[PDB]
Amino acid sequence: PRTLTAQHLNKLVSVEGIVTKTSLVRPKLIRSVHYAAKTGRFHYRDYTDATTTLTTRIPTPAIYPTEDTEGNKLTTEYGYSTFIDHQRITVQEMPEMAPAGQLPRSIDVILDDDLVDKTKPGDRVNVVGVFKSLGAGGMNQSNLIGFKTLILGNTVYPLHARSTGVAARQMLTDFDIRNINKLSKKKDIFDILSQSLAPSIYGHDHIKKAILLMLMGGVEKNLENGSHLRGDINILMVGDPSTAKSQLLRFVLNTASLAIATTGRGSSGVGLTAAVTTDRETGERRLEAGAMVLADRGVVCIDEFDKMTDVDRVAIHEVMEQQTVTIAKAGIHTTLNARCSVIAAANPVFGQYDVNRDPHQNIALPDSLLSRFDLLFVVTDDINEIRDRSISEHVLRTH
Amino acid sequence: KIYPKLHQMDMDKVSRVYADLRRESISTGSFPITVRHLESILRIAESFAKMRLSEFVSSYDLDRAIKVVVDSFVDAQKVSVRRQLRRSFAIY
Amino acid sequence: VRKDPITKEWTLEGGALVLADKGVCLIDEFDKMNDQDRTSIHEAMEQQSISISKAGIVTTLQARCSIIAAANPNGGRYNSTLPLAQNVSLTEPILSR
Amino acid sequence: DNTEIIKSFKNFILEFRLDSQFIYRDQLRNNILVKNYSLTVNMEHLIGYNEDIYKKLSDEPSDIIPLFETAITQVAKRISILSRAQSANSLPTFQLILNSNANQIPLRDLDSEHVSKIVRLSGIIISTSVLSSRATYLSIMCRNCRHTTSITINNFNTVSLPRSCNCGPDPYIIIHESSKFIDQQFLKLQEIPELVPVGEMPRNLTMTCDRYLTNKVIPGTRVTIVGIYSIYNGVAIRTPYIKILGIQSDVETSSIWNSVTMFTEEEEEEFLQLSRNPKLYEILTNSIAPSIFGNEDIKKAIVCLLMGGSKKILPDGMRLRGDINVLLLGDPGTAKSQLLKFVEKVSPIAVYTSGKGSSAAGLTASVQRDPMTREFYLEGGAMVLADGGVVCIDEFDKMRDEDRVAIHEAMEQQTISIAKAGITTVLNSRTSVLAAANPIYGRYDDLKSPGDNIDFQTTILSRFDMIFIVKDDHNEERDISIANHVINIHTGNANAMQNQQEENGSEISIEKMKRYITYCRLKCAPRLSPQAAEKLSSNFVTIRKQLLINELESTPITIRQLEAIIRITESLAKLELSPIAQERHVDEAIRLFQASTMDAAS
Amino acid sequence: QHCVAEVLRLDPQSGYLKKLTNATSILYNTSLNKVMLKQDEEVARCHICAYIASQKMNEKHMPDLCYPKKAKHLMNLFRQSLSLLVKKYCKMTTEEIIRLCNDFELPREVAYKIVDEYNINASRLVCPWQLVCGLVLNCTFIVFNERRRKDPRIDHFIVSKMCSLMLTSKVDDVIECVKLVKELIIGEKWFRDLQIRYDDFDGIRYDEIIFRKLGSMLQTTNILVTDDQYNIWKKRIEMDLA
Ligand SMILES: Nc1ncnc2c1ncn2[C@@H]1O[C@H](COP(=O)(O)OP(=O)(O)O)[C@@H](O)[C@H]1O
Numbered sequence A: 001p002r003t004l005t006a007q008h009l010n011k012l013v014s015v016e017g018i019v020t021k022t023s024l025v026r027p028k029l030i031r032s033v034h035y036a037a038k039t040g041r042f043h044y045r046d047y048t049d050a051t052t053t054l055t056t057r058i059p060t061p062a063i064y065p066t067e068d069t070e071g072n073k074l075t076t077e078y079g080y081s082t083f084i085d086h087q088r089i090t091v092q093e094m095p096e097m098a099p100a101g102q103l104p105r106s107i108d109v110i111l112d113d114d115l116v117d118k119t120k121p122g123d124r125v126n127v128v129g130v131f132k133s134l135g136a137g138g139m140n141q142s143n144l145i146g147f148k149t150l151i152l153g154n155t156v157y158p159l160h161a162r163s164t165g166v167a168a169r170q171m172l173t174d175f176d177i178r179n180i181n182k183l184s185k186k187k188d189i190f191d192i193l194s195q196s197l198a199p200s201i202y203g204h205d206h207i208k209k210a211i212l213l214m215l216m217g218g219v220e221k222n223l224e225n226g227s228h229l230r231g232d233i234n235i236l237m238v239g240d241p242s243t244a245k246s247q248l249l250r251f252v253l254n255t256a257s258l259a260i261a262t263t264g265r266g267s268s269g270v271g272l273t274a275a276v277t278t279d280r281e282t283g284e285r286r287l288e289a290g291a292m293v294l295a296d297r298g299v300v301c302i303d304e305f306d307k308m309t310d311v312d313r314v315a316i317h318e319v320m321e322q323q324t325v326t327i328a329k330a331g332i333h334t335t336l337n338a339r340c341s342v343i344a345a346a347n348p349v350f351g352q353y354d355v356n357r358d359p360h361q362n363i364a365l366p367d368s369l370l371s372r373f374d375l376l377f378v379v380t381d382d383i384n385e386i387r388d389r390s391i392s393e394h395v396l397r398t399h
Numbered sequence B: 001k002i003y004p005k006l007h008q009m010d011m012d013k014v015s016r017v018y019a020d021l022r023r024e025s026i027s028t029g030s031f032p033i034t035v036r037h038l039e040s041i042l043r044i045a046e047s048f049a050k051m052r053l054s055e056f057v058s059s060y061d062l063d064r065a066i067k068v069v070v071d072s073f074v075d076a077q078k079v080s081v082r083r084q085l086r087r088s089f090a091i092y
Numbered sequence C: 001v002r003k004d005p006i007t008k009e010w011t012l013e014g015g016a017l018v019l020a021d022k023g024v025c026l027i028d029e030f031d032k033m034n035d036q037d038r039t040s041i042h043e044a045m046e047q048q049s050i051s052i053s054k055a056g057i058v059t060t061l062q063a064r065c066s067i068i069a070a071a072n073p074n075g076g077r078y079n080s081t082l083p084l085a086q087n088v089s090l091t092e093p094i095l096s097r
Numbered sequence D: 001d002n003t004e005i006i007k008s009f010k011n012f013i014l015e016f017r018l019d020s021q022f023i024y025r026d027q028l029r030n031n032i033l034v035k036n037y038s039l040t041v042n043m044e045h046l047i048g049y050n051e052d053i054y055k056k057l058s059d060e061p062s063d064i065i066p067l068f069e070t071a072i073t074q075v076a077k078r079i080s081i082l083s084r085a086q087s088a089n090s091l092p093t094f095q096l097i098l099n100s101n102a103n104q105i106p107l108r109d110l111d112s113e114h115v116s117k118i119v120r121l122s123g124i125i126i127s128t129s130v131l132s133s134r135a136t137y138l139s140i141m142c143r144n145c146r147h148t149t150s151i152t153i154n155n156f157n158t159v160s161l162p163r164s165c166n167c168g169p170d171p172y173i174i175i176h177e178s179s180k181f182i183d184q185q186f187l188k189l190q191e192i193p194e195l196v197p198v199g200e201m202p203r204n205l206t207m208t209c210d211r212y213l214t215n216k217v218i219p220g221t222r223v224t225i226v227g228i229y230s231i232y233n234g235v236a237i238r239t240p241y242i243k244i245l246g247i248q249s250d251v252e253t254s255s256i257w258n259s260v261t262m263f264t265e266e267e268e269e270e271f272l273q274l275s276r277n278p279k280l281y282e283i284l285t286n287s288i289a290p291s292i293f294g295n296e297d298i299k300k301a302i303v304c305l306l307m308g309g310s311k312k313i314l315p316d317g318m319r320l321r322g323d324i325n326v327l328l329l330g331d332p333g334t335a336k337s338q339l340l341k342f343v344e345k346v347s348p349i350a351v352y353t354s355g356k357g358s359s360a361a362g363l364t365a366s367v368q369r370d371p372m373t374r375e376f377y378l379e380g381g382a383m384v385l386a387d388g389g390v391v392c393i394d395e396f397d398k399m400r401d402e403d404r405v406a407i408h409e410a411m412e413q414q415t416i417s418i419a420k421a422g423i424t425t426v427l428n429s430r431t432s433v434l435a436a437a438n439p440i441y442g443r444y445d446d447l448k449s450p451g452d453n454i455d456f457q458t459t460i461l462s463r464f465d466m467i468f469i470v471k472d473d474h475n476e477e478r479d480i481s482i483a484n485h486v487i488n489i490h491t492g493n494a495n496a497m498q499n500q501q502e503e504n505g506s507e508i509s510i511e512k513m514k515r516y517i518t519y520c521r522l523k524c525a526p527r528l529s530p531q532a533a534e535k536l537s538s539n540f541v542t543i544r545k546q547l548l549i550n551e552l553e554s555t556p557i558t559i560r561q562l563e564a565i566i567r568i569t570e571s572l573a574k575l576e577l578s579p580i581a582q583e584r585h586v587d588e589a590i591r592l593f594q595a596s597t598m599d600a601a602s
Numbered sequence E: 001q002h003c004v005a006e007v008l009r010l011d012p013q014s015g016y017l018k019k020l021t022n023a024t025s026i027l028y029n030t031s032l033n034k035v036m037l038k039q040d041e042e043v044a045r046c047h048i049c050a051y052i053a054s055q056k057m058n059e060k061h062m063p064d065l066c067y068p069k070k071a072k073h074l075m076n077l078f079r080q081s082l083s084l085l086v087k088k089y090c091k092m093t094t095e096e097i098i099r100l101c102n103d104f105e106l107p108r109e110v111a112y113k114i115v116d117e118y119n120i121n122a123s124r125l126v127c128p129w130q131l132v133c134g135l136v137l138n139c140t141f142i143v144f145n146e147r148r149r150k151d152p153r154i155d156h157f158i159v160s161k162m163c164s165l166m167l168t169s170k171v172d173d174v175i176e177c178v179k180l181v182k183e184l185i186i187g188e189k190w191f192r193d194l195q196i197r198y199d200d201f202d203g204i205r206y207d208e209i210i211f212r213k214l215g216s217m218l219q220t221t222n223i224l225v226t227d228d229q230y231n232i233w234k235k236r237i238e239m240d241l242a
C-alpha cells in the first residue's frame, strides 16, 4: 500500500501489511417489516446503498415508514426483521520492509458479515480485494479533492511473524504422524534430541534438554472452585560473558510453536497497556493487547535481567506462578490472563564465576526469585586446552 | 575575497618546535600537547592572514599564533607548570 | 518538527548554530544543559552536520558554524590549584575542539 | 492562429538534432517500448531552434500546453502503426515533462505579479500525504431516460456535469466500473533555513502533480522545481498555490538502501585489471588514508572489514555475523577521529553518529506515533538506517545503559527487537561497527590493567576482533616525520599531487574503489579450505597454553577470537576475489592479530 | 481608467472621446462623493453615465447608445439626485440581419450594403429571407474562395450551416436563393467593386479565364500540381523510416 495507486484501480489486489486499529461491530438493516394489525397482514420493505455491490445501480433514497397506503397504523418486528454486520479497518505496511525514516501509507478497508471477527491490532495481514473508489466530489454539485480511496475485500489471511502473539500453526500428514510414531518408539530420543536441538553449537547438553522440557511445558491444572495451578516453567542462566546464552536466545526464538522477544529494560508496557484508548467512534475507554499478555501458550525471551529494577521484579511475582494480572486504574478494575513461560540470562558483577567462592554472592538477586524460577543452571569459562581442542574442530567442521 | 595561502619555505620549523615542546611537556608536565593544537595554530595563521588581508602567510606572525596557543596552555594547568613558564619562553 | 500558530504549518527550525553555517553562534551558560542539547553541540563541532531521525523525515545539513560559549565555575573562583577538567565538571570530548 | 504554432512545435520533434544524432525522436521510440507514455525535455533546446513558441508559452502557458500534448499524441499515432507494420486502439494523452536551469528565484522575493506565469526556485521537502485520485474518463447514465453519455477531462487534476439532458435536475449517475482515473498528491515545500531572517518561522507552499511525475520524491531531498503560480479558493481573497510542470532532484541525496546494483560494463575490465594485480592489498593500504601517517596495521584491518565476510546460514536459523566488529582505543592525536570522519565519504550507504544518540537521532529505534490518526509507526534508527552498512561512532564511553544494551546485542547478532505495548518488532540491523575511545587521562593504561578506562571490563576483550593500543611514545623524530608528512597539505598540495601521480601510477581514487567495494560486497561467494583448517587450531591451542601460565601469574581469550580470524582471512583473500583460501594471507592474519595478543599481555 | 476607456470605446461596437471620458470620470465622482447613491453594482455602472454624458457635450443620439429594468430606475434616480420561406410577408430590421450576416464574422461594410439593398428594394416582396439568404451566400462565395480553393471540405459545412440556420432539410430552394439573386444583383458598380476586390469571376481568375475562353490551349487547367507542393510533400516521406 506504499505503491497501490490510481493505476489498476478496479483490478483485483492483494496487499501484505499490518493492522493498526479496528471498528466496533454493528448489526445493520437489510429489511424493515411493518405490520397491519387490522387484517393480519404484513408489508415488507428493504433497502440498499453504494457499498453492497460494485455495479453502479440506480439509487433509492428510502425513508422510514410510519403509515400505510390506506393510512392505517403500522408496527415493527425488531426480531423478524433481518439485519447484518459490518466492519472497517485501516491497513498499512509490514514494518519489517519499511522505508525506515518515513511514514507509513495507510488506507481504509471494509468488510461484511462472514469476515470480521478475525482481526486485531498487532497482526500481519494479506487480503484479496478491490480498490474501488466511489463518490461525486466536486463533479455534479459544486466546489479541491476527488474520491475516497479505499478497498473492499473477498478474502483475508493472517499468519506468523517473529514477535507477534500468533502461530504459523503448521500442519501434518499421515506420513508425518507415521514418522512421529516411528520417532517415539526409539529408546534414546530425548538424548539424541538434546544434541539435535542446536547442532550449530556444542556442549550445554543438560541445558538444551531443559529448553526442550520447557517448551513441552507442564499441564497447568485448575481447581474445582479454586484458583489455577501452574504448568509453565522458566529458566535462568548466568556465566562467563561470552558463552552461548545470547545466541541461544535467538536460537530458541524461531524454534517454538510460538515465541516473543525482549531486550531487557522497558517500562510501562512489558506486560502492561497504560489503558488510554484514543476513540472518536465514541468517548469511551478500553484496553489494547498487552505485551507479556501477548504470550498465552508460548515462551518468552528475556535477557539482562540484572539491569531490571525492582519496579517490575515486583510486578512479575503473580505472573510467574499465579500468571494473572488485575489492576485498579482510575477507569478500570478488570482481569486478564498471562499464562506464560520465560527464559532469562544474566551477567554477574565480576566477569566470571569461581567455585572456591560461593555461587550466591555474585548473582546479586533475592533468594525469592531464585526460588521463583524453576531452575537455574550456571556456566563457566575457566581455561584448559583439551576443553576447546575439539570445539575448535566442530566449529570449523560446521562453518 | 581573500583566501590567502601559505608557502612551504621554512615550515619544517613546525615539525621542529612541535617535537621540541611535545617532549618538553613530559619533561615537567602531566598532560600532553597534541597535533590538535598544531592544526589550530595553522588556522590562526591563516586567520591573521585574513586579518592583515595580506596575500599569503607571513613568517613573523606565526610567532603571534603560536604565542597565543602557548600562553593558552600556560594558564590551563597546575602550579607545576611554573617551570614551563621558564622553559617554553624561547619560542616567544 | 514544530507547529505554527498560523494554520498548523509544520516547519523545520534549527538551532542558531544552523543559521550561521557560514557565520557564528554565541551561547552563554553552556553548563546548563541536559543530555541531548549537549550531544547536539558535540555533533556540531565534530562533523559539522546534524542528523534527524524523527517524524517521517530524515536529513543532514551544514553546521560549519563558529562556536562561542561561556559557563560558570564551581565555586565562583577558579580553584587555581587544580587542572581544568578536575575543577569544572565539564567532559572532555567536546572540550578538545 | 493555433495550428501554425502546433507545426512550429511538431517540427522540433523530429527535425531537431545535436551532436549529429537524433535525440527526442528515438527517445520516444524507446519510451513507447517502455510503455511509458511520457518523455523528458529541455527548454534550453528550443530557444535557438525557434522563438515562435517561447515568448508565448511564457505568459500564456496553459493556453499552449495541451496543444503540445495533442501534437505528441499525433506523432504517436503514426509511429504506432508504422512500427506495427514493421514488427508485431487505446492511446491516451502523454504527460509531458521538462526541466530547466536558467535561474532559481526564492519564495521570499515573490509577489502577486507574474502570477500564472512560470517560475524557477529552490527549497526543501516535507509532505508524503496520500495518493489522492482524480478522473479522466467517466461514463454517465440517466436514471429515467436510461440515456447514456460520456465525459473526459484533461489537465486540471471549468465545468461540471450536465444540468439537463421529464427527468429534472441531477438526472445522472456516475458509473465506475467503466470509468477511468489518475493519481496526484499534495506536495509541500519550504526554503533553505540557512538563508532566512534571524527571527521568524518559515513559510511553506503546497503543489500538485500527476501520473508519472508522482512519487519521485521523499522528504529531506533538496530539489529544484518549476511550475505555474496558479490559484484556487479577509474581505475577498483566493489562496495562492502552484502547478508543477517540472521537477529535478539530486540523483540520490541521503543514502538510500534501495541503491544501484546493476553496474555498467566498461568498469568491469578495469575492475578485473585490479582483481588480477598482486598489488591489490598494498595499494588499498597506501590509499585509504593518503594524508595520514603510520598505523599501517590499523589501516590493514579496514579492508578486511568493509568487504564483510562469510554470510553462512544453517537449517536452524543460527546465522553467523557476516561482518566483523572493531574497536580503536587510544589518545588525542593518533588519527582516531579523522579516519572516522573520512569513512562515511568512501562509504556507499552507511552512517555516522556520536554517542547517546545525536541531536534528534535515536541510537536505536526510538519508536513513537503518527501526528494523524495517532497510530504506530517504526520511525528511525541509527542502527537500521544503515542496514547492510558500517556504523561510525565516537565517544563510546558515555553511553546510557538502555542505549548500550541493544547496540551491545547487535554486534553479536545484529537484530534489535522491541515489544512495547501494542507493536511487536523484529527489525534487522545487519551492520558493522567502528568504535573510538576516551582513555581516562590518556597513556598510563599500559602501566595498568587492560581496562581501567571505563566500567565495561567485560565486553572489551569479548565482543571485539580488532582492539589496539594506538600510540607511539613520543619518539623525537616520528613527530617531525608526521609533521612534514602533513604540513604540505595546507598549501602546495604536494600530498595531493603525490596521490594524483600515484593514481596515475598504481593507486585508485575514492569512487572507483567505492564501486569496487559495492560490487564485491554483493558479488562474491567465498569459502576457506579444509587445508587451512588446522593452521590456526594449532595457533589457538598454543596461545591458550601460553597465556595460561602468564595469566595464572596474576595479571580476553574467547572462542570468538578463534572464530574471528576465520573471517578476516577470508576477507583479505576476498579482495583477490577468492572462492578459496590458502596460507598466503593466513600468515598476514596472525601477523596482524598478534598486535591484539601483545595488547592482551599489556 | 482602463475599464473606463474600455466601456467608453465600447460605443462604436474628436472631442467626443475626450469629453466623454472626462464626463464619466466626474460623473462617477459626483455619484460616489455623497452618501446618497448606493446599492449600485459596478457590474453596470458606466452606461447611462455614458448616455447622459452624450446628452451633455453638444450632440446626442437616442439610437445605438442605450444598446433594462434598472436602466430606467437608475436614470431617474440619478437625474433626481443631481420553414422560413413558406412564411409569407415577414419583417426585418437593421440588427436582425446584422446578426444573420455577423454569424459568419463577415465585415460590417458588406452588411451595410445588404441593408441598403433591403431598405430601398424591400418594397415589392414576398419573403426577405430568400433575398438576404442569397445575398450573404454570394458574399461568402466571393470572399471565401481562397480557403475553399484549397479546402473543398468547406462547401458542405457552409451550406449545411445555412440549411439549418433557416431550418430546412430540403436545400435546392437554397440553390435557387443563390442563382436568383445572382440574376438580380448582377450588374451594379458596387457588386463590381467587390468582384475586382476579392476576385471570383465565377470563382476563377481573369488572367486565366480570358485565355480559357478566347480560344486557347495555353489555358492552364491545373491537373498537374505546382512545384512548392512537391517541395513540401517530399518531407512526408523523408522520415518514412519511423
Ligand atoms: N559451547 C560452545 N561451543 C561452540 N561454540 C560456541 C559455544 N558457545 C558459543 N559458541 C559460538 O561462539 C559465538 C559467540 O556467541 P555467544 O557467546 O552466544 O554470545 P553471548 O555470549 O552474548 O551469548 C556463537 O555464535 C557460537 O557460534
Ligand SMILES: Nc1ncnc2c1ncn2[C@@H]1O[C@H](COP(=O)(O)OP(=O)(O)O)[C@@H](O)[C@H]1O
Pocket: B034, B035, B036, B039, C096, D291, D292, D293, D331, D332, D333, D334, D335, D336, D337, D338, D339, D482, D486
Ligand atoms: N596520525 C596523524 N597524522 C597526521 N595528522 C593527524 C593525526 N592524528 C590527528 N591528526 C590531525 O590533528 C587534528 C586533530 O584530529 P584528531 O586527532 O583526529 O582528533 P582527536 O585529537 O580528538 O582524536 C586533525 O585535524 C588531524 O588532521
Ligand SMILES: [Zn+2]
Pocket: D142, D143, D144, D145, D146, D147, D164, D165, D167, D171
Ligand atoms: Zn435525462
